[PDB]
């Protein structure tokens, strides 16, 4: 029953915390070239000096969804949140469009956002990566 | 029947049809009961048939009429598990609409929402449609008395009056003849009791052989509340002509 | 770690690493003498010159990384590669609170004798003569 | 309390009596020393016979009240009319789980055929307390003695009305952030009754 | 850290100083402030320790990848634009770090030298001159610069700038490493 | 959505009107002044401040101008989509709810303060909206740096039984007082009248 | 075989990919498109396959602009072609933004070909089933002409054809191509090849799309210009 | 190399517009067809905005198959600026142009988060405090012929310059038919 | 039987048939050959006869430079080789960035084999129908390195190896004409041996043969058509002189 | 895992055809007839209403939908897919265009967005293609009036006049014999009524057919007055009474 998102800070760090981009030469260290972030961005710099509202905005919709699921569990039972989560997971897992980033129509219907617009909708948004094969590897887990 | 696929999932056949949707449609007549919905001047009446062949059953626990919100009632044709699933989802939809937009959910908007969910089920491969037919009745603050029906294919539409069941054709023909005679798309009565009696009379003359107070279920929607009648109320309505 | 003078240079056939073993007493008695230089491998050495825990922990970790690399490639790791591994690791945590200045000294067939200096700021300098300590100007002058 | 926000400086009272409960409040909203709203309805309805009054941040309490009304509509669709204890528990859970980010205090008054009228108070922090009567707000501090000297159990409706009127008139007289008209809601088995009293009436008490 | 760049009629001359990090007695013979981006494009950098070297090596790796992929060399203008993009991207979500870059190239297709300067915020300027570090040299450069200077005259002007700068350095100014980029590639001046 | 890029960079670089709403027996009136100031300088002597959420729902704002414009436009798009979806005329309560939840989501970091008036099948409605997500109902409201003079005028001559003409005159007088007595306000008076059962009437430069 | 053609990620016992082969086969059901590179420009011609009355000819289903220097002729499914065309336009703008220079043609062709190849290697994706003729100019190689098929392979050409009558059109182009031709000669050759290889009664203007690239500007011919050139060449 | 900061002036004539910027080659005025944009502020943000708007206008022309009009471009600039609500570019942009279909002149200015100021007479950006705004107010007259408008804007810039380094100006006079670009290196 | 429908199924005799089918796909590609000399490596490739209207100046070559000291040739599906080559180049640059040392030949071979193996571990992906030959010299080393990689992820080290169409005949010729005791001691001998090996399957001659030579200190040279023509003519003249006697 | 993917539901047949798209086209061809006619002053879009029973209120369900004040659409095929795609198009008109440029999109760009959405359903692992065909009529400042047809595969073409559905071939021939470059909007409406008369088997009156026009701006439909530059909607749906009056004439 949370309104404002809570527990947004990291509690542990490591040099292999990002499994997607790890060096093949030294598997315990991240791959700076394939990160494509400017090459001078250590992970430690991401732990300080953030805008206070950024974490609230990034996790807002997930928090509202979790509160709705908790209310359904309290009032309806386990089956209702189970079914909602199953529907959403099936819809999300069957969609794979490497050339587009827009959400599906059915996802919007399930989220009850058929006729709703937020700034995420208006503003949806290299040398290495950003290709179809990287998305294939990330999606399949290989 | 389906040759290869189309026996499990909802994809097109060579004829351009969705066999799983049609089979879900055929699944709606398993209960072999009928329901009727009519509009009054300021009320909407739904009457459903009760069949309790088993003598060990508790009759008071058998019902296909559900209360969705303060103003909306629903009648389901089909097996009771999918009926209860649909009822719970409709309750959640109405409550969320009220929370999100600041006013009560209208009957037609809820019908459209359920139909959109049904469209999801008809297009996704790993989802099956619910083999039920839903009928929502209310007295909308803008549109007056309202009856809207939704089916497994995702199609929804509003009705002056409607009937659904294995014997829906006879009731539909009788209603059409009556509305031809009266030239009015509703019932000209000032109380919902007269409308209930008229619906009971229509059901009796359409199905035949009549019934007692325990073979019927009646729900009535007014401008303020939707409520289901009890056995004594139905007995009074049967006695009163 | 002790800010005492530490020296390293490479003359013709190896590296001379020199430290002063004048330990500082406290509320303890040592069972044996302490060492100001960490033995990373039978072929690699490092110096602490900073936070003692950081140097000990991360140079033991570097020894593990070098061992795994040598097992994989069936060859001794180059000193440049080991110093680069340590530098990348310390740079990933730059500004978090670490403090360590180490001198990685090694000798390989392909490179020869090599000395690098790695700092907690991410600095990685190859050199011939290094003098880091409380008084290091005198030692550097005597060397030169 | 975020800078530039709106605070609910008010005088809130809720009293249980013989036939039910009564909830009363003033009607003043102030930003600093300026009366931003001279006529405010502070009696918030979350269910047909479950009402509340809010204190602290106005935005936070409005969001919490909206969520509570939504929750009670879901509960009613499933199980029927909830008890005042259930609404108080939902309010407490919302206020406590978010107390590090929201500043909310609630007074809940309710009626049902089982418990026959109840008052709950959730002060800042998220704890819940059930009391025969409750007072809250900046102007309540001036009537802690008076109420403690004038409350009786099982009072009639008129006696409860007079008690609330006198106490809120004193709170209005002494507190700057309070004033305007007195609003009251009477929750009994016979239904919901609304009452309003004007300054020319209660200032002569 | 001091970096100077002078563009002349036929080449680009880049001068850089040594490091002397912090109270560490180092004897070495190398240039740690210069990375060769391509056979006809050189980069000099001056700024905070750690970050600047990481950024320079990242840029060098990207440009080498492009050269291997296309079997073709980018022009100095495209290289400078890519460097500006990467520098502006690095400080997108972190506190900016001190860094100044001089990129000197020789466009073979246009057959002409080019020089660019990029500051820490990501401002790229095409210049005939350039300097970062110690803060007068602009006045001397403005007084003694011609667009049609030869390599020898540019080297003499650079020597004059070095002599002027040495009189204010605290006598620890060691040999400044000077490199020349022209149609024959990149070379280092012994003097 | 809205980006947080270059926040640290900007911090590093740094370290180195009168609006009124009145209610009458068959509708609402919203009026505003037309002076735009970029500080002490008058940028525009005729600037429109009455904005349209929907054909019969209008609003006027103060605070951060870009935030006010963006929030009004976004809520207008949402209202249009919802009205198409339900095949019904939009309601003032729906816009109020959307605005309140959008402003509560951003925790007051969007600096929009609004007066929203309108008519719908349920009647006539006037609301005030705060940047932190709190809303209130009223019969007459004022906003802006000239709001105290306008509120004095409103408190002088307001009563329950008001015709359309009297309401228009009262709103015009409140804006005039803001114009004369406040340095931030001036120039012309823009009005918009909404009645139950009629089109909205938008009168630009009503008195002058 | 029916055992090895249902999925795109399964090899046949002979090492063949049947879904890719079927995607290649689908190309022959599309109208012919011809590209000819002369010594001073490039000519693209395309025969509309679904031409009929009541169709708005003034308002293009086969010739598209990627940027100011690159154009494409399309053979196959038009919706997949539009997807890939929008992707290519975005990639060209990305290259311009990053490097402040216009993207070379071969880089763009290779990017699109990689996208197609990737779409041949995932179980949930089917091949695009489109063929592209790229015509471009860059400062490195000058004028250049490429083709790409659904399998992800691309090739450079002097004169190429894709679509319904590739064999006959290629025979004619082989018999009639000269390295030193001009743009007008290439226009005449392309029109004559389209008139010979077409299965319709006659080659009119309403069944043609025409484009040229020459010093650099792209000219996409209007129907009146097509009619004028048809009259001039004697085809009428 | 300095570059940061500057001034931009836009003025409306009878059937023409004028846009001028200061100059020490780094120029603060760009065009995307028949629409001109002048940016003052941080050099990095000016370059970034120029590249982004070139990107977006090229895509717009490829899709719409027509050049973008000044009003639509103004809306695009406003939305792009508001996207960076909490990390805004340190820029003051000004837009000038002539609408192709109607022929009417158009000038507008923006704040750093996209608030639009549509002025009928003139717009000053960079430093409209010291002398430029007052000089333009004292010199501007409505409905001026292109020669008169050019003289007025050039004189305003010259008067501002005297209020000592190498100073120049770049002026664009835009009519529906042609655009004339001149320099004022004085 | 019913055991060749997925990559995750063993046959009763212990085979995975989709791997063999990917090898069958490789068998249809143009021939590639690699010969390791005393101090050089030679990679030869067979090219299909260029069509008359084909532009023979911009089409990619059959031998690609992964780095300044390592070259790669392939056989099989041409479009998958682009993906593999791009990944190899990115990995070489990443290794240089991470360890300041350029890759060794064996390390790059192992990375390529790892990518190929990783693309065999899901039922939703297709393995690369490519077999590769990777040649080069380790930095500051003078020992030539030649390796072969297969679609399953297996890599091997060879003194001379052929892959692709009709590679068995070329392999038999190499076995007859190549001995590890006395490898060819000059670049000319290695190139001549590679040309003669390719001439056993190449239908036309010098116009269907491509040759790249790798020598220490990162010396990578692509021979022109004229030099290959000279080698072919010399071989033909020697054969004619032998037959005349 | 074997649930991190799902194989493609649309694949190429050995002949080179995508079977699911062809079956969706068949489903479209089994639908009710709809048509569009493009004139010099406007565009007419028309269709035949159908009812499961006479007791249904045909006005509740409308096959003609306003996408923008200047763009409308009609259909042939399956209704729920229509409803989903219309909602998506109405949302996209705002998210992609009006929140960026301050104006509604032209007809062709909205058609392109809808067609992209439809194409993405034919390259998926868990949705079938939409079994529906679209007619979109619109007007914009720099292109005038336009009429487009969109297929289940996502291909769209501009038409001077066209028809889709069960009686599409005969209607196409009748429109071919009755179209010219100088037609007017009223003539187009009359031709559309005549064409629909040949396809409706039952009652051909105002309660069984549905028509809408893209014509001139209707300031009486704006809902507010005071801004001379605010143009009213050009999309207008004809009432049943107007259709009856035109049929009588």
């Amino acid at each position: 029953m949370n309104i404002v998102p809570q527990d947004t800070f990291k509690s542990q760090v490591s040099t292999d915390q990002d499994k997607s981009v790890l060096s093949s030469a030294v598997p315990s260290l991240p791959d700076t070239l394939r990160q494509q972030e400017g090459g001078a961005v250590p992970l430690s710099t991401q732990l300080n000096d953030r805008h206070p509202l950024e974490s609230t905005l990034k996790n807002w919709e997930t928090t509202q969804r979790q509160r709705q699921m908790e209310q359904y569990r309290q009032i309806f039972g386990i089956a209702e949140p189970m079914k909602r989560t199953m529907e959403m997971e099936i819809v999300n897992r069957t969609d794979f469009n490497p050339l587009s980033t827009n959400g599906s129509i059915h996802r919007d219907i399930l989220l009850n956002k058929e006729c709703s617009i937020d700034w995420e909708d208006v503003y949806p948004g290299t040398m290495v990566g950003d290709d179809v094969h990287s998305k294939i590897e990330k999606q399949l887990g290989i | 029947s389906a040759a290869g696929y189309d026996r499990h999932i909802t994809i097109f056949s060579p004829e351009g049809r969705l066999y799983q949707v049609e089979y879900a449609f055929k699944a709606t007549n398993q209960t072999n009961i009928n329901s009727l919905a009519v509009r009054g001047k300021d009320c909407t009446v739904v009457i459903s048939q009760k069949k309790v062949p088993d003598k060990l059953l508790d009759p008071t626990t058998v019902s296909y009429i559900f209360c969705i919100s303060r103003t909306i009632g629903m009648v389901v044709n089909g097996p009771i598990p999918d009926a209860r699933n649909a009822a719970l989802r409709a309750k959640a939809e109405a409550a969320e609409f009220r929370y999100k937009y600041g006013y009560d959910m209208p009957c037609d908007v809820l019908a459209k929402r359920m139909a959109n969910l049904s469209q999801i089920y008809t297009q996704r491969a790993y989802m099956r449609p619910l083999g039920v037919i839903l009928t929502f009745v209310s007295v909308d603050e803008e549109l007056g008395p309202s009856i809207y029906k939704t089916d497994p294919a995702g199609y929804y539409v509003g009705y002056k009056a409607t009937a659904t069941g294995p014997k829906q054709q006879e009731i539909t023909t009788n209603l059409e003849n009556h509305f031809k005679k009266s030239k009015i798309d509703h019932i000209n009565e000032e109380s919902w009791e007269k409308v209930v009696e008229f619906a009971i009379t229509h059901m009796i003359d359409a199905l035949g052989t009549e019934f007692s107070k325990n073979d019927l279920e009646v729900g009535v929607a007014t401008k303020d509340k939707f409520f289901t009648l009890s056995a004594e109320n139905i007995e009074e309505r049967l006695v009163a002509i | 770690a002790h800010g005492t003078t530490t020296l390293a240079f490479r003359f013709q056939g190896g590296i001379i690493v020199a430290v002063d073993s004048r330990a500082t007493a406290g509320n303890w008695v040592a069972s044996q003498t302490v060492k100001k230089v960490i033995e990373i491998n039978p072929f690699l050495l490092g110096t602490m010159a900073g936070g003692a825990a950081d140097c000990q922990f991360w140079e033991t970790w570097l020894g593990s990384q070098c061992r795994l690399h040598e097992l994989r490639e069936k060859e001794r790791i180059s000193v440049a590669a080991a110093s680069k591994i340590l530098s990348n690791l310390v740079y990933q945590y730059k500004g978090a609170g670490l403090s360590m200045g180490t001198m990685i000294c090694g000798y390989t067939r392909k490179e020869g004798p090599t000395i690098y200096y790695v700092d907690s700021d991410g600095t990685r300098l190859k050199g011939d003569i290094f003098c880091v300590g409380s008084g290091q100007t005198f030692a550097y002058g005597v060397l030169d | 309390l975020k800078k530039g926000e709106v605070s609910l400086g008010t005088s809130i009272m809720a009293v249980t009596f013989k036939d039910g409960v009564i909830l009363g409040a003033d009607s003043r909203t102030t930003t600093g020393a300026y009366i931003a709203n001279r006529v405010t309805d502070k009696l918030t309805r979350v269910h047909d016979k479950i009402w509340c009054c809010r204190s602290g941040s106005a935005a936070d309490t409005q969001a919490i009240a909206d969520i509570v009304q939504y929750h009670l509509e879901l509960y009613t669709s499933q199980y029927g009319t909830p008890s005042t204890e259930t609404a108080a528990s939902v309010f407490k859970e919302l206020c406590y789980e978010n107390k590090d980010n929201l500043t909310a205090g609630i007074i809940v008054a309710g009626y049902d055929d089982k418990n026959k009228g109840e008052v709950y108070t959730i002060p800042l922090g998220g704890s819940v307390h059930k009391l025969p009567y409750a007072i809250a707000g900046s102007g309540s501090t001036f009537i802690y003695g008076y109420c403690d000297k004038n409350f009786r159990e099982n009072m009639s409706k008129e006696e409860t009305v007079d008690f609330i009127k006198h106490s809120l008139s004193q709170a209005i007289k002494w507190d700057g952030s309070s004033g305007g008209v007195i609003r009251m809601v009477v929750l009994t088995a016979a239904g919901v009754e609304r009452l309003i009293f004007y300054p020319d009436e209660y200032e002569q008490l | 850290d001091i970096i100077l760049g002078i563009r002349v009629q036929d080449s680009v001359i880049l001068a850089s100083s040594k490091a002397v990090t912090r109270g560490i007695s180092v004897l070495k013979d190398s240039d740690d402030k210069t990375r060769q981006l391509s056979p006809h494009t050189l980069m000099s950098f001056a700024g905070e320790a750690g970050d600047t070297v990481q950024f320079a090596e990242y840029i060098q790796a990207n440009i080498q990848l492009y050269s291997i992929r296309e079997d073709y060399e980018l022009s100095p203008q495209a290289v400078s634009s890519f460097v500006r993009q990467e520098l502006a991207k690095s400080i997108r979500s972190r506190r900016p770090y001190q860094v100044n870059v001089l990129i000197g190239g020789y466009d073979k297709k246009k057959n002409k030298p080019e020089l660019y300067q990029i500051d820490y915020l990501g401002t790229k300027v095409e210049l005939p001159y350039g300097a970062h570090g110690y803060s007068y040299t602009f006045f001397l450069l403005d007084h003694h610069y011609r667009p049609d200077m030869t390599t020898e005259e540019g080297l003499d002007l650079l020597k004059l700038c070095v002599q002027e700068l040495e009189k204010r350095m605290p006598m620890d100014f060691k040999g400044v490493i000077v490199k020349i980029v022209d149609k024959d590639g990149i070379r280092q001046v012994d003097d | 959505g809205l980006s947080f890029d270059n926040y640290q960079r900007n911090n590093f670089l740094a370290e180195n009107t009168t609006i009124v709403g009145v209610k009458f027996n068959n509708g609402v009136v919203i009026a505003a002044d037309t002076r735009s100031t970029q500080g002490p300088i008058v940028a525009d002597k005729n600037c429109a401040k009455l904005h349209r959420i929907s054909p019969k729902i209008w609003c006027a704002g103060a605070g951060t101008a870009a935030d006010t414009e963006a929030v009004t436009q976004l809520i207008g798009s949402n209202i249009e989509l919802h009205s198409l979806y339900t095949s019904r005329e939009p309601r003032v309560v729906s816009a109020l709810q959307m605005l309140k939840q959008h402003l509560f989501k951003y925790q007051g970091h969007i600096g929009a303060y609004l007066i929203v008036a309108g008519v719908d099948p349920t009647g006539s409605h006037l609301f005030s909206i705060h940047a932190h997500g709190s809303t209130d109902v009223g019969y007459y409201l004022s906003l802006g740096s000239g709001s105290l003079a306008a509120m004095a005028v409103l408190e002088s001559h307001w009563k329950q039984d008001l015709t359309k003409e009297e309401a228009i005159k009262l709103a015009s007088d409140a804006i005039q007082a803001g114009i004369w007595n406040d340095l931030g306000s001036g120039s012309n008076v823009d009005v918009c009248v909404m009645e139950i059962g009629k089109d909205a009437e938008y009168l630009r430069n009503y008195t002058p | 075989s029916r055992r090895y053609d249902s999925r795109t990620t399964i090899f046949s016992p002979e090492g063949r990919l049947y879904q890719v082969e079927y995607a290649l086969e689908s190309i022959s059901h599309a109208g012919t498109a011809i590209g000819i590179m002369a010594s001073d420009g490039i000519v693209l011609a395309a025969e509309r396959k679904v031409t009929s009355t009541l169709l708005e000819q003034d308002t293009t289903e086969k010739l598209y602009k990627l940027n100011d220097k690159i154009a494409v002729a399309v053979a196959g499914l038009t919706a997949d072609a539009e997807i890939l065309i929008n992707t290519a336009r975005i990639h060209a703008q990305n290259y311009l933004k990053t490097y402040n220079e216009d993207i070379p043609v071969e880089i763009l062709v290779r990017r699109l070909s990689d996208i197609k190849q990737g779409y041949t290697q995932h179980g949930g994706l089917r091949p695009f089933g489109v063929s592209f003729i790229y015509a471009g100019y860059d400062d490195r190689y000058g004028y250049q002409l490429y083709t790409s098929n659904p399998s992800g392979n691309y090739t450079g050409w002097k004169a190429i054809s894709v679509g319904a009558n590739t064999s006959a059109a290629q025979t004619l182009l082989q018999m009639d191509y000269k390295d030193d031709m001009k743009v007008d000669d290439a226009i005449e050759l392309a029109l004559k090849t389209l008139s010979k290889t077409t299965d319709s009664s006659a080659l009119t203007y309403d069944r043609l799309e025409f484009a040229t690239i020459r010093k650099v500007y792209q000219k996409i011919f209007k129907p009146q210009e097509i009619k004028d050139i048809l009259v001039k060449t004697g085809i009428t | 190399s300095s570059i940061n900061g500057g001034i931009v002036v836009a003025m409306t004539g009878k059937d023409c517009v004028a846009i001028a910027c200061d100059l020490r080659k780094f120029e603060k005025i760009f065009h995307y067809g028949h629409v001109f944009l002048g940016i003052t502020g941080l050099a990095t943000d000016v370059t970034t905005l120029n590249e982004m708007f070139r990107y977006k206008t090229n895509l717009y022309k490829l899709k719409e198959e027509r050049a973008i009009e000044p009003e639509t471009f103004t809306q695009l600039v406003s939305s792009s600026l508001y996207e960076r609500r909490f990390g805004p570019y340190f820029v003051g942009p000004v837009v000038a142009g002539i609408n192709s279909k109607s022929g009417k002149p158009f000038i507008a200015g923006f704040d750093l988060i996209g608030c639009i100021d549509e002025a009928k007479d003139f717009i000053v950006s960079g430093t409209a405090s010291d002398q430029l705004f007052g000089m333009c107010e004292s010199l501007y007259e409505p409905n001026l012929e292109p020669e008169d408008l050019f003289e007025t804007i050039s004189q305003a810039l010259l008067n501002a310059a005297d209020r000592l380094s190498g100073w120049g100006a770049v002026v664009y006079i835009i009519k529906k038919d042609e655009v004339v670009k001149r320099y004022l290196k004085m | 039987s019913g055991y060749d429908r997925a990559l995750s199924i063993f046959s009763p005799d212990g085979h995975i048939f989709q791997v063999e089918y990917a090898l069958e796909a490789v068998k249809r590609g143009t021939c590639a050959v690699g010969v390791k000399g005393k101090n050089c490596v030679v990679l030869g490739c067979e090219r299909r006869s260029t069509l008359k209207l084909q532009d023979t100046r911009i089409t990619p070559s059959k031998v690609s430079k992964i780095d300044s000291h390592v070259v790669l040739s392939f056989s099989g599906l041409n479009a998958d080789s682009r993906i593999l080559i791009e990944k190899a180049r990115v990995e070489a640059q990443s290794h240089r960035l991470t360890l300041e040392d350029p890759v060794t030949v064996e390390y790059l071979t192992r990375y390529v084999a790892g990518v190929q193996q990783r693309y065999t571990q899901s039922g939703g992906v297709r393995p690369f129908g490519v077999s590769t030959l990777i040649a080069g010299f380790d930095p500051r080393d003078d020992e030539p390195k030649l390796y072969q990689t297969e679609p399953s992820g297996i890599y091997s080290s060879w003194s001379a190896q052929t892959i692709g169409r009709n590679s068995k005949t070329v392999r038999e010729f190499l076995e007859k004409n190549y001995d590890r005791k006395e490898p060819p001691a000059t670049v000319e001998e290695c190139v001549k041996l590679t040309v003669r090996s390719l001439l056993e399957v190449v239908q036309t001659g010098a116009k269907n043969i491509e040759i790249t030579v790798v020598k220490p200190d990162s010396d990578i040279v692509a021979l022109s058509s004229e030099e290959i023509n000279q080698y072919v003519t010399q071989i033909e003249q020697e054969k004619q002189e032998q037959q005349e006697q | 895992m074997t649930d991190r993917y799902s194989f493609s539901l649309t694949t190429f047949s050995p002949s080179g055809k995508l079977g699911q798209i062809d079956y969706a086209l068949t489903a479209v061809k089994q639908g009710v007839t709809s048509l569009g006619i493009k004139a010099t002053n406007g565009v007419v879009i028309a269709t035949e209403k159908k009812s499961s029973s006479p007791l249904a209120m045909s006005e509740t369900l409308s096959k003609v939908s306003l996408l923008t004040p200047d763009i409308g659409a009609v259909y042939s095929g399956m209704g729920p897919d229509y409803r989903v795609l219309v909602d998506k198009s109405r949302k996209v008109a705002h998210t992609s265009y009006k929140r960026i440029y301050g104006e509604y999109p032209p007809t062709k760009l909205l058609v392109s967005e809808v067609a992209k959405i439809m194409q993405e359903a034919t390259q998926s692992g868990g949705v079938r293609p939409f079994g529906v065909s679209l007619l979109i009529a619109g007007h914009d400042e720099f292109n005038g009036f336009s009429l487009y047809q969109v297929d289940p595969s996502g291909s769209y073409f501009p038409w001077k006049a066209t028809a889709i559905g069960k009686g599409s071939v005969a209607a196409k021939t009748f429109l071919e014999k009755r179209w010219n470059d100088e037609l007017e909007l009223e003539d187009a409406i009359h031709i559309a009524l005549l064409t629909l008369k040949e396809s409706v088997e039952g009652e051909f009156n105002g309660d069984t057919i549905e028509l809408a026009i893209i014509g001139d701006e209707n300031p009486d439909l704006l809902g507010y007055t005071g801004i001379p530059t605010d143009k009213g909607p050009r999309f207008r749906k004809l009432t049943s009474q107007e259709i009856n009056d035109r049929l009588e004439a």
Side-chain angles (χ1 to χ4, degrees), chain B residues 59-74:
Chain B
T60 72
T61 62
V62 190
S63 177
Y64 290 87
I65 299 182
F66 305 81
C67 307
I68 307 301
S69 66
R70 181 188 174 181
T71 57
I72 298 179
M74 190 185 59

Side-chain angles (χ1 to χ4, degrees), chain I residues 20-30 75-76 129 163-167:
Chain I
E20 306 190 14
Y21 297 173
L23 275 184
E24 292 285 349
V26 169
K27 287 179 183 182
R28 300 189 173 201
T30 57
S75 188
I163 60 179
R165 179 174 57 195
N166 305 124
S167 56

Side-chain angles (χ1 to χ4, degrees), chain A residues 68-84:
Chain A
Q68 181 183 352
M69 294 295 101
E70 174 65 28
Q71 290 177 275
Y72 287 162
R73 194 219 76 192
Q74 293 183 16
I75 300 184
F76 288 133
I78 306 170
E80 208 67 28
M82 179 183 59
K83 286 181 296 183
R84 300 302 192 94

